[PDB]
């Protein structure tokens, strides 16, 4: 078991629709996501104090950051980001 | 039922038809009307959008078909109608086992043959027949048209409908003696 | 529909029979087990001051081989079921007025009266009928009744099948009147 309630979650990437197709279209690429995974508590709603350990706590979200960073091509200023995305949901000890 | 959209961007639509695909049914539907083509227009099999679709409507109305050439190599067909068309006499292969429904309303019809009624005997769907407002010949061998008509009552939608050819009168009012004196 | 907990203890039925009545269904079967026996006396009706006791009905079909001489003509009795018996005559006297469906499934079908047809009006009610492995024979009269059920094609529920001996198929098919 864990300390904090975290549930695996799937996010499906978001889908590029043919509205110009005025016409029906294969659900095929609907039916299979490649999708990216995330971590929520669902504890209280990421509320609960991780009961079964006594000591002053309260479970929080953590996140994690993907620093992707390429010089143009066009030979512009240097292109950097940093997604964040929810990585995990820990408990930590707190004081009064 | 009347969420309808484009036919796959697919040229496969006969000419005067103006075809669509519908959803809900899976049922790519054929909507050649007003005398688009004399003849029976080609069938466009479900392997087209994406090969979906199993059933398939024929919408021929108003129209001067007088051969079904309808074929059981064409058991895509679920419905057709074939209103308001000069067909005298029909055949066997021309009603395919597969179908549905058939109406075939305010035709030219007078015929039958047991061959062609064979499937009177139930069908892997329920044949669902409206044909009516048609003059249809009167003998014998129309009586064993009659009593088919008697014993499948529930099959057709009407029996008030149907007429005598030269006089008009409810196909009911007949046993197959008076019609053999 | 729940029987014989709707249906108190005033048993019009005989133990013989298990007679229950139905709320829903409106009716009480007579529901008995017994075949070849007397005519099932099930003629009282609790109403029970309530519309779910004002029908009637028959289980074993095969309760006697002379069919059952319903000579109170009760409005309770609506759907008849009759099965694996030799009958062989009908009183009109017998069938009621307010009944609506009868068999004569697994029994014989010999020269029956015009009086049966006239008795039964479909204006006042719908008539529905079974016949089926009616093996006895047909004759002239017996072609007047079935040229009868043949006009009345609808009320004849059954006339797909019913056939006779001489005829050897169905008694429609044939209705040569020069052959009794
Ligand atoms: C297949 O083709 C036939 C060919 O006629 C289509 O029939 C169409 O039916 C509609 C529905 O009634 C008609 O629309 C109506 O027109 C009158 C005329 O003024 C108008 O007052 C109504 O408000 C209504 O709009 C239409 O005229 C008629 N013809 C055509 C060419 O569309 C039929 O709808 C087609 N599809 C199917 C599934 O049958
Ligand atoms: C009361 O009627 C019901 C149904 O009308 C009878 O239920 C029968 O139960 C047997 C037991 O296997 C089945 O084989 C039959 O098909 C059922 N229906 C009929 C019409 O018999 C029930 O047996 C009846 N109870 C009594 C005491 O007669
Ligand atoms: C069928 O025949 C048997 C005779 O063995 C009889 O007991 C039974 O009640 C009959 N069934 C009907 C529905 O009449």
């Known amino acids: ?96 | 039922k009347d969420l309808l959209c484009d036919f796959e961007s697919a040229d496969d639509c006969p000419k005067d038809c103006q075809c669509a695909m519908r959803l809900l049914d899976h049922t790519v539907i054929v909507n050649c009307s007003g005398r688009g083509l004399t003849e029976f227009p080609d069938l466009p099999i479900p392997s087209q959008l994406h090969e979906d679709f199993n059933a398939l409507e024929v919408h021929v109305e108003n129209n001067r078909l007088t051969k079904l050439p309808n074929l059981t190599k064409h058991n895509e067909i679920t419905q057709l109608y074939a209103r308001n068309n000069s067909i005298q006499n029909l055949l066997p292969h021309n009603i395919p086992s597969k179908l549905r429904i058939i109406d075939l309303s305010q035709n030219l019809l007078k015929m039958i043959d047991d061959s062609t009624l064979a499937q009177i005997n139930r069908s892997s769907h329920l044949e669902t027949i409206r044909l009516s407002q048609n003059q249809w010949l009167c003998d014998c061998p129309a009586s064993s048209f009659l009593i088919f008509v008697q014993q499948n009552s529930r099959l057709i939608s009407d029996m008030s409908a149907i007429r005598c050819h030269p006089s008009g009168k409810s196909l009911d009012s007949i046993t197959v003696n008076e019609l053999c004196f």
């Open chain 1, 1 to 96: 078991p864990f300390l904090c309630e975290s549930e695996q979650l799937l996010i499906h990437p978001k889908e590029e629709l043919s509205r110009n197709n005025s016409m029906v279209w294969i659900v095929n690429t609907k039916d299979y996501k490649q999708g990216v995974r995330i971590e929520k508590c669902l504890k209280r709603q990421l509320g609960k104090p991780c009961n079964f350990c006594d000591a002053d706590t309260e479970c929080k979200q953590l996140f994690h950051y993907r620093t992707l960073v390429a010089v143009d091509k066009v030979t512009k200023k240097p292109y950097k980001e940093q997604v964040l995305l929810p990585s995990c949901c820990k408990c930590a000890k707190i004081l009064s």
